[PDB]
């Protein structure tokens, strides 16, 4: 039954097409039908369209058989028929209603083509024609990407509908034109990128934060490869220049995500502007703690762009972060006590009784205590406990004990040029081989991203870089490799290319040199590439097969080749495919290591399809190891959207049903995948449960280690309880298990420290941070690295680390104490509103404080508003006409 | 002991407008689901591992026979014989065979017995009768703290009670206070109690055990207290854990002198629950959460400060909480611009969270009545009295 | 099995007879055409009973 009262609609809009010959009647009825369909679809908010429902059935027969109409007029009457047939597009026609668009609204444009559409709110030819230019245009660009003019006039039609979508309704469809541009213009994405550039950047300034959030979230999970992942990365480049706010330190972000492009894009986004450098661009420099070369680019060679040329360089490097950190520890938040290893190793009151002595100064436990003491007071200039009076303490170990204890002592004074060398001068003339090598390690340790102008590591270690002693070479080359983590200057290359190219150095020495050079350069370094490959060729089969250090050579290659796509990896596979079956491990290492954040199926499809399942029943050892370790590489943080089912596919599938030798220790991946301390998500179930299961030795030892990830500052409560449940009460008797238990579960106390590679903003990783990859392959090997004390420098290699502190300054010093709002993350940005990263207050700390990733801060009450809006632990409370 | 449970998938809802950002995110989810499926399929496709011990296992099975009836080890005697009660309830003095792990025998553990000549032949640590297994949450509810509007103090208290101890508890023994063993939610119906329980079970890191309260009662004598005991044994066994007993007044009513056997058994079930709640130390990581509307009708021994210290009040939502709830429940709606939503919030009523949700649903229905989906203000205006059915005018003016 | 207790078949899911009798196997003979008045009531009952079931998409 129909409405009856308005039963004229199934009569007059029915007889007008039914009566349909006489051209004058044709034109008049077409005009009337246009008017009625417009008056209905355009303002009548009822989704139901009286004509469109009553045109249907009749429309699919009349307006389809009358669609030809023999073109009675040139196009105007045909224009009327097309305007009529463009009404019953959604339901009257089949799925190729996009073909209806082709021959009804793409072939012809009724004057202003949206004359009967732009009036419609979103449906008739905005949501509908949006669907058609993201479905028809999608299939045609898939099959006929460069078509006839049916690809260019459709492109311009998409252009005006896309911009109108911003200015036909001015509503939250502002999130649909970025959507359209992502889908529409599949291969010509950049054309639509420039289209919304020239539209939105000139339309209105506030309607661009939505653009940025959309493109950022798509940047997190774009298409599989960086052909349009790169294009979406480049989309906000117009949306960051003077077309929007110029400060926008996020230039470092959308240059970092695309291969960390410094000398092609950062040359223009910050190196060319250099105009508001006195503003937060200086803290943009400060929040750019990876790419010293960026400011060396203008500062050193001219020293005339701004007076803060080398002083700004030095201050953001290490010195003032150290000073404000010390202020946070002593002056402001009084948590800077005398904290050695002993103060908390016996933090359990169970160890007091039942010992019956059990006090042994053996190598493993004393070594673990030295490592723990070094880790706990990292970057602390106050650990005068096992340092000065403890010369005999440094003496009371086994041979590797000296080198590790001295490296730990150097770690105590992290990134401190003055204190570090005035405390290593006493141990520089150590008068013992192993302690001397540890001393060179300490000297190369106080250069953790320091980028010292005086370059103390180079000169101070060049006497021993090639000196005839394996421990000397190990210490020297490892220290220099840690010193030059950021840049790849030709001096260090011309110094170590002879070294790793030297046959005098052992294959452990060659491997650690490879690790050094791989974390020296993160680009190509074709000299390094050729040198490493001619190594892997000139080595003999047994040596390259079962060295126990043969991993580090392809590990160095991958660490050099980390981040950049499979471009160099193609030829790398070509000239490693000619190698021994160990090249399988080498390839599945270097290739996948070329992706730090590349969250995609196809690559992890190879890892879990050809590398995992085509290796489950196959006993090719250590091929599955890197497989599952790097399952979370390229997946370490795709906004953690790709991390949780990584946890699921690892715990459910890998740990539960994996091989006892190639996949049962698929567990340091958990260390790499996500590190904050989360019960039943990263730490409690998957680690503690497999840790109680001490059935597999390597699994248990490595699993106790894996808490090192969360151990940066886990708020050791519920993690220390674990340790006390396994110290004395657990794997106490097992000497090596207890050693790693002490080391890993006790180096938590290093306060205000953070090992995660993903940056503070969260949308960018940090390649220098990702150089904590060598103590993942080495840590999984467990043979002569961790469980066996063959080489403990990899455990020392954890100086890819940043503070977790907070602080605010106003162009001078940290003295500002504005209230902060740190609390767990919530929805923001791409939803209806950018709700603050903290859902509520939580802690209301006004002084500078601590901020782990599930604790991010927001400003208060609008005093001296920071234009950084990133709070990279060094926020700039820059004043303005505050409280306007 | 083993670890917690209740695995859930990803929050998504980072967008919710189907702007293809939802599509990339769900595509990543589905792709990784395909990865898991392919991996496990191909693993079981090639997984040859069996036999090994065989003949020793074969003869120990032959000694075990078939079937082997499970029993509850009530008491142990010198380490060759023990007292075990069959599931019927009759208990026998049986022998313990050599191949059973004497360390595992502990009063309460399910022990495999020979069908003929009963004898302890194995130990089951995962009996977990189907009732308590069902009472365990597997797929966490989709609601979240973002879905809760208002109740800031309530969420804050419930997190201090059943999140802060499971996460870093160092503050609690730093201050010397014990963590609050057990919290109870109360207030008028439809205020956000069960919703808060869902939200807690979502952002949780412990085994969540949902209980109806009336579910604990069982027909057969001794089945009630046995079920309560097994439920809490599972809670401790899967510690840390959260035991949510909804509608606690189904059993928590005033204790009175029982006459009928059924009333006696109900009293016994509550006594077992209270004794069990006393049994585990507050330092232990098993917390209980009970909700009820009729708080006054509860036993004043279930709410003793030594047993259930916290008491979270859920008042009818205020005007600001009403507007937060309306923002939450109209978020998905395609509201027209003319709707103000402040007239309904103004109207001094007893609108609850559930009442607001129903008002929104009825407004959507009325919009559908006019063939539209834009939902004007008139639809809300009529929906308010459509849902709100039922002081004599000028008394108090 | 009899007393060997060997699982030898899988049977449909357990519903106890008391609640299985509750299913309306034999539909009753009462049409909306035999209901006078109540047109508004019938539409309201349908908007909750059959509209969500028939079409949850709206």
């Amino acid at each position: 039954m129909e409405e009856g009262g308005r039963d004229k609609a199934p009569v007059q809009p029915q007889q007008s097409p039914a009566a349909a010959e006489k051209p004058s009647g044709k034109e008049r009825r077409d005009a009337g039908d246009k008017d009625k369909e417009q008056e209905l679809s355009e303002e009548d908010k009822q989704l139901q369209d009286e004509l469109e429902m009553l045109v249907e059935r009749l429309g699919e027969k009349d307006t389809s058989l009358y669609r030809p109409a023999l073109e009675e007029l040139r196009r105007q009457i045909r224009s009327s028929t097309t305007s009529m047939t463009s009404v019953p597009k959604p339901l009257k026609f089949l799925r190729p209603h996009y073909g209806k668009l082709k021959e009804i609204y793409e072939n012809m444009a009724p004057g202003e083509n949206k004359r009967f559409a732009a009036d419609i709110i979103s449906v008739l030819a905005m949501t509908m024609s949006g669907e058609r230019e993201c479905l028809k245009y999608r299939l045609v660009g898939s099959q006929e990407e460069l078509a006839s003019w049916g690809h260019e006039y459709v492109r311009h039609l998409a252009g005006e509908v896309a911009k109108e979508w911003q200015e036909l309704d001015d509503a939250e469809k502002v999130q649909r034109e970025p959507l359209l541009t992502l889908v529409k213009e599949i291969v010509p994405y950049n054309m639509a990128h420039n289209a919304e550039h020239e539209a939105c950047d000139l339309l209105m300034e506030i309607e661009q934060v939505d653009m940025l959030e959309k493109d950022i979230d798509e940047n997190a999970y774009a298409k599989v490869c960086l052909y349009l992942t790169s294009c979406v990365n480049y989309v906000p480049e117009p949306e960051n220049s003077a077309l929007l706010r110029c400060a926008l330190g996020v230039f470092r972000k959308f240059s970092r995500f695309p291969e960390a492009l410094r000398l092609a894009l950062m040359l223009n986004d910050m190196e060319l502007v250099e105009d508001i450098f006195t503003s937060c661009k200086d803290v943009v420099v400060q929040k750019q703690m990876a790419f010293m070369l960026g400011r060396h680019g203008v500062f050193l060679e001219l020293s005339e762009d701004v007076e803060e040329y080398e002083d700004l360089t030095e201050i953001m490097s290490n010195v003032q972060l150290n000073s404000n950190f010390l202020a946070l520890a002593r002056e402001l938040d009084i948590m800077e006590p005398k904290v050695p290893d002993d103060i908390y190793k016996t933090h359990l009151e169970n160890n007091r009784f039942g010992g019956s002595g059990s006090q042994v100064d053996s190598a493993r436990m004393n070594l673990a205590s030295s490592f723990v003491n070094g880790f706990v007071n990292a970057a602390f200039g106050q650990d005068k406990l096992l340092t000065d009076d403890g010369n005999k303490w440094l003496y009371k170990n086994k041979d590797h004990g000296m080198l590790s204890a001295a490296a730990s002592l150097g770690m105590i004074l992290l990134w401190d040029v003055d204190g570090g060398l005035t405390q290593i001068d006493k141990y520089l003339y150590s008068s013992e081989d192993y302690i001397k090598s540890g001393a060179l390690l300490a000297c190369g340790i106080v250069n953790s991203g320091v980028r010292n102008e005086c370059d103390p590591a180079l000169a101070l270690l060049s006497d021993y870089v090639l000196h005839n002693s394996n421990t000397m070479r190990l210490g020297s080359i490892f220290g220099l490799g840690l010193a030059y983590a950021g840049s790849n200057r030709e001096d260090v290359l011309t110094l170590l290319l002879p070294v790793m190219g030297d046959s005098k150095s052992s294959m452990e020495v060659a491997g650690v040199t490879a690790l050094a050079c791989g974390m020296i350069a993160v680009g190509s370094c074709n000299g390094d590439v050729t040198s490493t490959i001619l190594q892997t060729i000139m080595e003999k089969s047994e040596t390259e097969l079962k060295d126990t250090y043969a991993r580090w050579l392809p590990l160095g290659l991958g660490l050099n080749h980390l981040g950049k796509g499979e471009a160099i990896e193609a030829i790398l596979a070509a000239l490693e495919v000619v190698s021994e079956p160990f090249r399988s491990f080498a390839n599945t290492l270097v290739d996948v290591c070329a992706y730090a954040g590349s969250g995609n199926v196809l690559k992890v499809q190879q890892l879990l399809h050809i590398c995992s399942e085509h290796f489950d029943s196959k006993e090719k050892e250590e091929d599955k190891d890197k497989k599952e370790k790097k399952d979370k590489d390229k997946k370490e943080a795709p906004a953690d959207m790709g991390a949780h089912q990584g946890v699921a596919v690892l715990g459910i599938a890998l740990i539960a049903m994996g091989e006892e030798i190639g996949a049962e220790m698929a567990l340091r991946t958990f260390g790499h995948l996500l590190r904050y301390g989360e019960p039943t998500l990263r730490r409690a179930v998957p680690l503690a449960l497999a840790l109680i299961s001490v059935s597999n030795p390597r699994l248990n030892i490595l699993d106790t280690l894996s808490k090192f990830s969360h151990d940066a500052d886990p708020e050791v409560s519920y993690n220390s309880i674990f340790a006390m449940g396994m110290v004395g009460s657990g794997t106490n008797n097992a000497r090596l298990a207890a050693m790693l238990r002490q080391l890993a579960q006790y180096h938590a106390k290093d306060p205000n420290n953070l090992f995660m590679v993903r940056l503070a903003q969260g949308l960018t990783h940090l390649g220098k941070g990702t150089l904590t990859l060598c103590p993942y392959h080495s840590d999984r090997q467990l043979m002569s690295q961790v469980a066996v004390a063959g080489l403990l420098t990899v455990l020392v290699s954890f100086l890819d680390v940043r503070n977790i502190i907070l602080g605010k300054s106003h162009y001078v010093l940290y003295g500002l104490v504005a209230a902060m709002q740190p609390r767990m993350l919530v929805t923001f940005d791409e939803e209806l509103r950018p709700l603050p990263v903290s859902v509520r207050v939580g802690q209301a700390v006004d002084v500078v404080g601590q901020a782990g990733k599930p604790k991010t801060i927001t400003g208060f009450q609008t005093h001296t508003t920071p234009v950084l809006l990133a709070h990279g632990e060094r926020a700039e409370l820059a004043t303005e006409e505050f409280l306007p | 002991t083993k670890g917690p449970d209740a695995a859930s998938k990803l929050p998504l809802v980072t967008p919710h407008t189907q702007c293809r950002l939802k599509l990339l995110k769900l595509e990543r989810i589905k792709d990784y689901l395909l990865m898991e499926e392919e991996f496990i399929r191909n693993q079981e496709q090639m997984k040859p591992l069996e036999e090994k011990q065989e003949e020793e296992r074969s003869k120990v099975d032959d000694l075990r026979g078939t079937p082997m009836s499970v029993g509850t080890l009530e008491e142990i005697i010198d380490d060759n014989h023990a007292i075990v009660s069959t599931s019927v309830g009759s208990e026998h003095y049986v022998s313990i065979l050599s191949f059973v792990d004497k360390d595992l025998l502990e009063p309460g553990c399910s022990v495999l017995l020979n069908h003929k000549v009963h004898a302890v032949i194995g130990v089951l640590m995962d009996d977990t009768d189907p009732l308590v297994t069902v009472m365990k949450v597997e797929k966490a509810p989709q609601e979240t703290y973002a879905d809760i509007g208002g109740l800031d103090n309530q969420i804050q208290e419930i997190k201090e009670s059943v999140e802060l101890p499971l996460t870093h508890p160092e503050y609690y023994e730093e201050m010397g206070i014990k963590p609050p063993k057990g919290v109870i939610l109360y207030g008028p119906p439809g205020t956000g109690k069960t919703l808060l329980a869902k939200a807690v079970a979502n952002q949780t890191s412990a085994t969540f055990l949902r209980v109806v309260g009336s579910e604990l009662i069982q027909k057969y004598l001794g089945d009630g207290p046995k079920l309560v005991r097994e439920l809490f044994r599972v809670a401790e066994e899967h510690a840390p854990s959260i035991v949510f007993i909804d509608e606690i007044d189904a059993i928590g009513t005033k204790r009175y002198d029982s006459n009928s056997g059924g009333e006696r058994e109900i009293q016994r079930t509550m006594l077992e629950l209270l004794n069990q709640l006393d049994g585990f130390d507050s330092r232990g990581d098993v917390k209980v959460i009970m909700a009820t509307n009729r708080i006054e009708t509860l036993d004043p021994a279930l709410i003793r400060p030594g047993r259930i210290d916290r008491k979270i009040e859920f008042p009818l939502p205020d005007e600001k909480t009403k507007k937060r709830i309306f923002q939450i429940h109209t978020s998905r709606m395609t509201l027209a611009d003319d709707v103000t939503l402040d007239d309904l919030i103004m109207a001094k009523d007893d609108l609850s969270g559930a009442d607001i949700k129903a008002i929104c649903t009825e407004a959507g229905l009325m919009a559908l009545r006019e063939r539209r989906m834009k939902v004007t203000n008139e639809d809300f205006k009529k929906s308010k009295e459509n849902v709100l059915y039922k002081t004599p005018e000028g008394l108090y003016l | 099995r009899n007393d060997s207790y060997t699982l030898h078949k899988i049977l449909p899911n357990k519903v106890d007879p008391l609640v299985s009798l509750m299913m309306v196997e034999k539909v009753p003979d009462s049409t909306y055409e035999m209901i006078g008045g109540l047109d508004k009531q019938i539409k309201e009952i349908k908007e909750v009973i059959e509209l969500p079931v028939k079409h949850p998409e709206l």
């Binding site: 039954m1 409405e3 989704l47 139901q48 369209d49 469109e52 429902m53 249907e56 959604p90 339901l91 449906v123 949501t127 509908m128 949006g130 669907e131 993201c134 479905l135 | 407008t17 189907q18 702007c19 293809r20 939802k22 599509l23 769900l26 595509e27 589905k30 395609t334 559908l368 009545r369 063939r371 989906m373 | 047109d39 539409k43 349908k46 509209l51 028939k54 079409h55 998409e57 709206l58």
Partner: peptide, 30 residues
């Protein structure tokens, strides 16, 4: 006012027209 039951055409039009262009793939994927 006698409120009309939504017709099959009305159901069909409600399922479309006022829909996001990504309803189909989103629902299918979920």
């Amino acid at each position: 006012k006698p409120i009309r039951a939504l017709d099959e055409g009305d159901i069909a039009l409600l399922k479309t027209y006022g829909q996001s262009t990504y309803s189909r793939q989103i629902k299918q994927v979920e």
